Amino acid sequence: HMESADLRALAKHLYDSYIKSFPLTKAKARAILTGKTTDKSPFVIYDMNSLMMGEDKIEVAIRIFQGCQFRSVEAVQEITEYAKSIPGFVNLDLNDQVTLLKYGVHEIIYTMLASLMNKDGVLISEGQGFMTREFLKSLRKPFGDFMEPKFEFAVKFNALELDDSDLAIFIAVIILSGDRPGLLNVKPIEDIQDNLLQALELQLKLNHPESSQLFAKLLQKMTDLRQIVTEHVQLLQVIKKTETDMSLHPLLQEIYKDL
Amino acid sequence: ESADLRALAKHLYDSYIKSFPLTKAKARAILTGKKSPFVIYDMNSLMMGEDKIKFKHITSKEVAIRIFQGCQFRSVEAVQEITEYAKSIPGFVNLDLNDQVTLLKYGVHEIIYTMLASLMNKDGVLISEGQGFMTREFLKSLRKPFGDFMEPKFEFAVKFNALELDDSDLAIFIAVIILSGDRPGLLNVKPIEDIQDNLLQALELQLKLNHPESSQLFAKLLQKMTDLRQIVTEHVQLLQVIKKTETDMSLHPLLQEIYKDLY
Ligand SMILES: O=C(O)c1ccc(-c2nn(C(=O)c3c(Cl)cccc3C(F)(F)F)c3ccc(Cl)cc23)c(OC[C@@H]2CCCCO2)c1
Numbered sequence: 001h002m003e004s005a006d007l008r009a010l011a012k013h014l015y016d017s018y019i020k021s022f023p024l025t026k027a028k029a030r031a032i033l034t035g036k037t038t039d040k041s042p043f044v045i046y047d048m049n050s051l052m053m054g055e056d057k058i059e060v061a062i063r064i065f066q067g068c069q070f071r072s073v074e075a076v077q078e079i080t081e082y083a084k085s086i087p088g089f090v091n092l093d094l095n096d097q098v099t100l101l102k103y104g105v106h107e108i109i110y111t112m113l114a115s116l117m118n119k120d121g122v123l124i125s126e127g128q129g130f131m132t133r134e135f136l137k138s139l140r141k142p143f144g145d146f147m148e149p150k151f152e153f154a155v156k157f158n159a160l161e162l163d164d165s166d167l168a169i170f171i172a173v174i175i176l177s178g179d180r181p182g183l184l185n186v187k188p189i190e191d192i193q194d195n196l197l198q199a200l201e202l203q204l205k206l207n208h209p210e211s212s213q214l215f216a217k218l219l220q221k222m223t224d225l226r227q228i229v230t231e232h233v234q235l236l237q238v239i240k241k242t243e244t245d246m247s248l249h250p251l252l253q254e255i256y257k258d259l
Numbered sequence: 260e261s262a263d264l265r266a267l268a269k270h271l272y273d274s275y276i277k278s279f280p281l282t283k284a285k286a287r288a289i290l291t292g293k294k295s296p297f298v299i300y301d302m303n304s305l306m307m308g309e310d311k312i313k314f315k316h317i318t319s320k321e322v323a324i325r326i327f328q329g330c331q332f333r334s335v336e337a338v339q340e341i342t343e344y345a346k347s348i349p350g351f352v353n354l355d356l357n358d359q360v361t362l363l364k365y366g367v368h369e370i371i372y373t374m375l376a377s378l379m380n381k382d383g384v385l386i387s388e389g390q391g392f393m394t395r396e397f398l399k400s401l402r403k404p405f406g407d408f409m410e411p412k413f414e415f416a417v418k419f420n421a422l423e424l425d426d427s428d429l430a431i432f433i434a435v436i437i438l439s440g441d442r443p444g445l446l447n448v449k450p451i452e453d454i455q456d457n458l459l460q461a462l463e464l465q466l467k468l469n470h471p472e473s474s475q476l477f478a479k480l481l482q483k484m485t486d487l488r489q490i491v492t493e494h495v496q497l498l499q500v501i502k503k504t505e506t507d508m509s510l511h512p513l514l515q516e517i518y519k520d521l522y
């Protein structure tokens with residue numbers, strides 16, 4: 001369908017655009033998380049007092065929640081800019097562009113959040129901070145149990161040991177899903193996705209030649225993504241009905257209309 | 260090792276034919292009008308069909324309940340067919356016995372949905388090994404939540420059948436589903452993923468040889484595992500509403516026990 005050199009060219013194009021779109025790459029995140037580096041060392045928030053100190057240096061459960069919301073809105077912006085660089089995307093019907101982004105952003109946010117995580121916590125404020133998993137999970141009300149499922153996913157996803165060049169193509173595959181509800185013209189979407197899938201396949205064989213059927217294992221993760229986004233939506237709805245005082249950025253609000 | 264992957268595909272195809280009563284190939288010949296099946300399209304024809312053909316399930320006198328229970332009864336039969344097929348998958352019987360049970364327990368729903376599509380088109384479903392055809396409009400027009408319980412199955416089947424898999428494809432796909440290393444409570448995940456890797460390799464080659472013009476069909480088929488997980492989840496929630504709502508669902512406790520897995 002497509003030839004090797006063109007598939008490599010498409011992989012390079014997507015990697016380059018992923019670097020331009022997203023300020024904190026997996027490579028930077030891992031350097032910070034593993035360290036042995038004096039200049040990139042994060043301030044660690046593990047309890048109430050350190051949270052207070054962290055805000056000098058850089059209700060609690062609400063404030064943290066709103067922090068997640070703020071970064072997710074920024075992430076939607078970053079993902080939207082990346083999507084525009086995917087060959088063919090901006091040429092699609094405009095309603096279909098909206099639909100693809102609407103249903104894809106959440107799955108991509110979860111994917112890319114994993115890059116910022118290990119089993120003990122998450123990088124924040126462009127890598128300047130690290131908030132512990134124990135602290136997040138111990139938050140009160142339903143807020144604790146709202147944070148933990150993200151770590152549970154990230155630990156499993158990070159076991160695949162993808163790098164940024166891999167993720168660039170994977171994220172593109174997610175966006176160009178022809179099975180989203182209400183798509184008007186499925187065919188041109190599937191045509192682009194076939195190219196991306198071919199590109200992802202070759203990328204993974206060259207970049208992880210010892211890792212048998214990594215292509216398939218990675219596509220199987222799209223299943224974990226769909227499920228957790230569904231749980232997420234239902235958890236958020238219970239939170240809104242309990243906490244009629246906090247609200248959501250209009251953009252996220254619109255994304256959640258009809259889930 | 261191509262030859263070994265072909266050997267594995269043939270082994271699975273042969274066993275899938277022995278295990279399952281009606282193949283996709285036979286079902287499609289019946290569905291496309293290629294000894295017509297008895298057609299159930301309303302209440303009167305249902306009555307005649309069970310009087311003359313004797314569709315097993317029949318014994319609540321209320322039709323919508325009886326059809327619903329019929330789905331459950333056939334699904335229980337399917338569990339035993341799937342269990343027998345699983346034993347023919349190389350490596351499966353050597354797994355820890357608790358893990359065999361776990362894999363089957365959490366896989367059977369996804370497999371039943373998959374294989375149900377083989378028996379469906381946009382207009383209805385074959386029953387009793389293809390001796391009967393019950394229309395989609397009849398099923399969907401059943402009252403209360405029963406109609407809306409039937410329709411999602413057709414909605415899935417129509418999309419899945421667009422891939423135009425044949426039995427030799429499906430034999431490997433079903434095996435891939437069974438050998439899922441992410442099932443809850445698995446004790447020894449490694450040998451499960453090892454077998455699945457072999458099956459995935461076998462499925463990949465099968466699809467390239469059998470459908471060489473069908474680009475990235477391997478990937479499209481794995482993406483259907485997403486539709487499968489989602490609809491099984493919906494299914495569970497639909498079942499739960501029915502149990503809490505319906506007072507006339509009662510069967511002999513022993514029948515109830517037999518079906519506990521699917522209610
Ligand atoms: O820097 C980033 O790239 C980033 C991305 C996501 C979160 C984050 N979102 N979130 C959500 O619950 C969430 C998600 Cl996954 C998707 C869409 C919308 C939301 C929303 F928050 F609106 F509801 C999280 C839940 C838990 C955790 Cl640990 C993180 C997220 C992100 O987090 C920012 C940090 C988290 C700790 C407190 C300071 O902000 C960053």
Ligand SMILES: O=C(O)c1ccc(-c2nn(C(=O)c3c(Cl)cccc3C(F)(F)F)c3ccc(Cl)cc23)c(OC[C@@H]2CCCCO2)c1
Nearest residue numbers: 326329330331333334337368371372375384386409412521
């Ligand atoms: O011959 C077969 O291979 C076969 C397989 C499945 C059904 C059937 N199950 N079902 C379910 O709701 C279902 C499913 Cl999809 C998966 C797991 C468990 C269940 C359960 F029934 F337990 F709850 C159906 C729903 C609708 C329809 Cl149209 C069919 C199924 C099957 O059905 C046999 C027919 C259905 C109509 C009445 C006579 O039996 C056959």
